């Protein structure tokens, strides 16, 4: 049994830079990008429901997803996205805590950015949150993919507020001004996760 600790944050609050740095003390790091798109590759059993619900084509030749493909009619049709979650959802869920289950680190780091919209902070042990200013995002992804300012501000006001995120979380990393501050950041936390870690399992009371 793992304690999870949940990590996220909003758009450009460089989530990679501070899961990074936990994975040079020795934690595994579980994303829940990565996890939604390995249910997909080939092999997987979510490709085969895949061709019999929106089409055959849907899955190419060698068997591997066209990935950038189906995104295209899903979104021209946006009310089998939620049918193609019903689907994908149940085997993320698996996939996920087949891959805590196989981590060997003290505590594994679950890196999920939309922890608060979807409310997966229910399923942490603790939550770790990685905060900027909103112009810090807006710069970051101003950079990192060359796009307009109001393009990432739209995006905001998709993602949950700064504020939401901050009323679930557990610790708070500051991110904006050089990848570098962090490291005295994630030693600290890292040690006390470490202690979390090993009392937990037979903890008789709270805190």
Same mark, same amino acid.
């Given at each position: 049994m =793992?304690?999870?600790?949940a990590?996220?944050?909003g758009? #450009?609050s460089?989530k990679?830079?501070?899961?990074? +740095?936990f994975?040079?003390?020795? $934690?595994?790091?579980i994303?829940?990008? $990565?996890?939604?798109? *390995?249910?997909?590759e080939p092999?997987? %059993?979510a ?5 019999d619900?929106? #089409? ?5 030749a /060698? ?5 950038r493909?189906l995104?295209? =009619?899903?979104?021209a049709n %946006?009310?089998e ?8 959802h149940?085997? $993320? *869920?698996?996939?996920?805590?087949h891959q805590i289950? *196989?981590?060997t680190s %003290?505590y594994?780091?679950?890196?999920v950015?939309?922890?608060?919209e979807?409310?997966l902070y229910?399923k942490?042990?603790?939550?770790l949150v990685v905060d900027?200013? %909103?112009?810090? !995002?807006l710069? =970051?992804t101003?950079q990192?993919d060359d796009?307009t300012?109001?393009?990432?501000? !739209?995006?905001? +006001?998709a *993602?949950?507020?700064?504020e939401?995120?901050?009323?679930? +979380? /557990?610790?708070?990393? /500051?991110?904006n001004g050089?990848? /570098?501050? $962090?490291?005295s950041?994630? +030693? =600290?936390?890292h040690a006390?996760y470490l202690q ?6 037979? !903890?008789?009371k709270?805190?």
């Open positions: =793992r304690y999870i600790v990590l996220t944050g758009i #450009g460089g990679s830079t501070v899961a990074n +740095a994975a040079d003390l020795g $934690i595994n790091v994303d829940a990008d $990565i996890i939604a798109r *390995q249910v997909v092999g997987a %059993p490709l085969h429901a895949i061709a619900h929106f #089409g055959a084509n849907m899955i190419a /060698d068997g591997t997803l066209q990935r493909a995104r295209e =009619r899903i979104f %946006p009310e996205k939620n049918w193609l979650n019903a689907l994908l149940p085997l $993320i *869920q698996q996939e996920t805590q289950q *196989q981590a %003290p594994v780091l679950w890196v950015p939309l922890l608060v979807n409310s229910k942490a042990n603790r939550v900027v200013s %909103p112009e810090t !995002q710069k =970051r101003m990192r796009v300012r109001e393009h990432v501000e !739209q995006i905001l +006001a *993602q949950a507020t700064r939401a995120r901050l009323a679930v +979380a /557990d610790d708070v990393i /500051d991110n050089a990848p /570098d501050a $962090i490291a950041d994630v +030693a =600290r936390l006390h979390l870690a090993s009392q937990f399992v037979s !903890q008789e709270p805190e």
